[PDB]
Amino acid sequence: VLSAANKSNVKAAWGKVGGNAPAYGAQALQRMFLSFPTTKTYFPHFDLSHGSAQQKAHGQKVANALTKAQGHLNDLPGTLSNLSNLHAHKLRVNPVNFKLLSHSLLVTLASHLPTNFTPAVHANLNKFLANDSTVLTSKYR
Amino acid sequence: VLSAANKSNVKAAWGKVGGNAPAYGAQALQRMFLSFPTTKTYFPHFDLSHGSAQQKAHGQKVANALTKAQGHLNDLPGTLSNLSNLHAHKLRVNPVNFKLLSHSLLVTLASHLPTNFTPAVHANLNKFLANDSTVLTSKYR
Amino acid sequence: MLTAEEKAAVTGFWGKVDVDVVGAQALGRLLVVYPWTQRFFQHFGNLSSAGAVMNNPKVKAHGKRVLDAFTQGLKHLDDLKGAFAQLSGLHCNKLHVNPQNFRLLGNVLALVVARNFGGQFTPNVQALFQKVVAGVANALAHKYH
Amino acid sequence: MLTAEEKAAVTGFWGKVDVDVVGAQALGRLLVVYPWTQRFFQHFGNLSSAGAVMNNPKVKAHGKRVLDAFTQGLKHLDDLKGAFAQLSGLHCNKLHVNPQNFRLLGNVLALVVARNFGGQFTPNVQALFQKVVAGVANALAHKYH
Ligand code: HEM
Numbered sequence: 001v002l003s004a005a006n007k008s009n010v011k012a013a014w015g016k017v018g019g020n021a022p023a024y025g026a027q028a029l030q031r032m033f034l035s036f037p038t039t040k041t042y043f044p045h046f047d048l049s050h051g052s053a054q055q056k057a058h059g060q061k062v063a064n065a066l067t068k069a070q071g072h073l074n075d076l077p078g079t080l081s082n083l084s085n086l087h088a089h090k091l092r093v094n095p096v097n098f099k100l101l102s103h104s105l106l107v108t109l110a111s112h113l114p115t116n117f118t119p120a121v122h123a124n125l126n127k128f129l130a131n132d133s134t135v136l137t138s139k140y141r
Numbered sequence: 142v143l144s145a146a147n148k149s150n151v152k153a154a155w156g157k158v159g160g161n162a163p164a165y166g167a168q169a170l171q172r173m174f175l176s177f178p179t180t181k182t183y184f185p186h187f188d189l190s191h192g193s194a195q196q197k198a199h200g201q202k203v204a205n206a207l208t209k210a211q212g213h214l215n216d217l218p219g220t221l222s223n224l225s226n227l228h229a230h231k232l233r234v235n236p237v238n239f240k241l242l243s244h245s246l247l248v249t250l251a252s253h254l255p256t257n258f259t260p261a262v263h264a265n266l267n268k269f270l271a272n273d274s275t276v277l278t279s280k281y282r
Numbered sequence: 283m284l285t286a287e288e289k290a291a292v293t294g295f296w297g298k299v300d301v302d303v304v305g306a307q308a309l310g311r312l313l314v315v316y317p318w319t320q321r322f323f324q325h326f327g328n329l330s331s332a333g334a335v336m337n338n339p340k341v342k343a344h345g346k347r348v349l350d351a352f353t354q355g356l357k358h359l360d361d362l363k364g365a366f367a368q369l370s371g372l373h374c375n376k377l378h379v380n381p382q383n384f385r386l387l388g389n390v391l392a393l394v395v396a397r398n399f400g401g402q403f404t405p406n407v408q409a410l411f412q413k414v415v416a417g418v419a420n421a422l423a424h425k426y427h
Numbered sequence: 428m429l430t431a432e433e434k435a436a437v438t439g440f441w442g443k444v445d446v447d448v449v450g451a452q453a454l455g456r457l458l459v460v461y462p463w464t465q466r467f468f469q470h471f472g473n474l475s476s477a478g479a480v481m482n483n484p485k486v487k488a489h490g491k492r493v494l495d496a497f498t499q500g501l502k503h504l505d506d507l508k509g510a511f512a513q514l515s516g517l518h519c520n521k522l523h524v525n526p527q528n529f530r531l532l533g534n535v536l537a538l539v540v541a542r543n544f545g546g547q548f549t550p551n552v553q554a555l556f557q558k559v560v561a562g563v564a565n566a567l568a569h570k571y572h
Pocket residue numbers: 039040042043061062063065066083086087091093097098100101132133
């Protein structure tokens with residue numbers, strides 16, 4: 001449970017998104033900046049603008065991995081294996097901060113794809129980000 | 142998710158636990174109704190609480206599932222599917238609730254083998270129960 | 283509670299908010315997305331389907347009032363946990379929900395309004411609405427007895 | 428809701444309990460179990476093995492005055508929010524700590540209390556202690572943001 005229809009709204013989801021995913025990363029954070037302020041300590045560096053190329057090249061990145069991850073629901077643990085450990089682990093990136101970042105993209109998500117965005121699109125995603133977070137937290141675990 | 146000094150751990154802790162393991166869920170299960178009430182709800186058949194025969198009868202059963210559970214640390218889903226969806230799809234044990242037994246039994250643990258229960262065995266023993274723990278929640282995620 | 287310049291913003295944007303299906307939906311999804319909350323309502327009948335649960339006249343009515351109810355929060359948003367006192371009552375009373383499910387539920391309404399609203403549920407309105415459920419999640423269970 | 432008393436008529440139970448050894452106990456167990464703990468305690472050094480993360484003079488001290496801190500607090504419950512508003516200034520302004528954590532070092536605490544004292548630790552001694560935690564780093568979220 002990575003479960004088939006889960007997987008099959010997840011990618012359909014994912015899929016309406018496209019080249020927007022870029023967009024959504026950084027609206028994401030744009031976003032957890034201002035709405036779960038304690039996260040902002042991770043982003044020392046980081047001209048969190050407002051809307052700032054810092055966030056942007058970042059926002060770039062949290063969705064390119066998103067996007068992979070969408071496209072191979074079986075082998076996340078071998079998939080995230082670089083990034084499970086940046087985060088976990090070297091980053092050390094409170095778990096109570098993942099559930100954070102993930103609500104804010106289902107906002108985001110859910111703000112832009114309300115036609116397509118169903119309790120079922122809604123649940124399969126929730127869950128997917130759900131299946132994200134538990135991989136990149138393994139340190140822990 | 143366990144580290145293999147982890148499975149390690151979990152094991153002379155759990156193999157110290159002994160034939161005590163049935164009094165061990167009695168004591169935890171009787172530790173949370175007390176300490177984190179709102180969980181008492183999951184149990185209208187029994188008189189609950191205190192030294193109770195429904196309650197030594199069920200800590201058996203919590204107790205067993207766990208001797209089982211590690212036992213075979215390479216693979217808890219396949220040992221729990223049976224389990225852990227009736228708590229996950231027929232009772233509908235909210236997951237929050239996971240982490241109070243967790244403490245209930247780690248604090249249940251911690252009281253019986255504290256020359257034993259080591260900064261490095263609560264660690265391992267804590268991981269072990271997020272994980273028995275994650276797979277009883279399945280059903281969803 | 284916030285800038286009055288902030289209170290200003292949710293007061294105005296609460297109000298364009300349609301109460302009937304902004305809680306049907308928010309009750310609605312809460313429904314098949316936390317599948318376990320689904321406990322507290324044998325209370326109506328059919329949550330064993332997404333179609334079902336939503337529509338389900340009952341979990342409909344439920345949100346109607348599970349919602350300007352909240353959203354009657356504010357007026358006062360303010361003094362207190364006052365307000366809400368009350369339905370605490372009821373909530374640790376004979377349901378007995380986690381202060382935990384207050385906060386989903388609060389988080390389901392922000393997915394609602396984000397997508398009904400849509401480009402206006404803004405990281406600053408997103409922002410302040412956040413507080414608001416942080417607040418209303420919170421009195422309801424500080425409340426405990 | 429302190430009951431009165433089991434509460435404090437039950438901390439009686441309190442001191443006798445010890446400092447340096449509980450806090451350093453409680454602060455050292457918490458620092459090896461939720462490793463993300465550490466990011467925060469920087470001040471500080473080895474925290475390179477469960478080992479001297481236990482040694483830690485740094486950690487050891489600090490386990491004290493923390494325990495010392497509260498504990499004391501065990502002292503008037505009445506108005507907890509009072510007592511360390513002072514210090515939700517600090518968790519909140521200074522280092523920006525998650526609430527989340529507040530319960531994490533109390534339930535470490537519940538555990539390290541339950542190692543310490545034993546059988547001495549009831550269903551009864553743990554749930555009275557099981558709620559200081561709860562008002563104490565819930566007192567802690569009052570305020571902050
Ligand atoms: C969806 C969850 C997530 C993904 C898919 C995601 C992706 C990343 C990616 C693709 C990078 C840098 C890898 C690169 O240059 O190879 C990264 C680094 C980090 N991640 Fe995340 N991330 C998640 C969640 C979070 C959360 C919740 C926080 C914080 C609160 C967090 C904080 C960071 C920081 C702070 C960096 C660092 C860049 C440096 O300092 O060199 N991450 N993540």
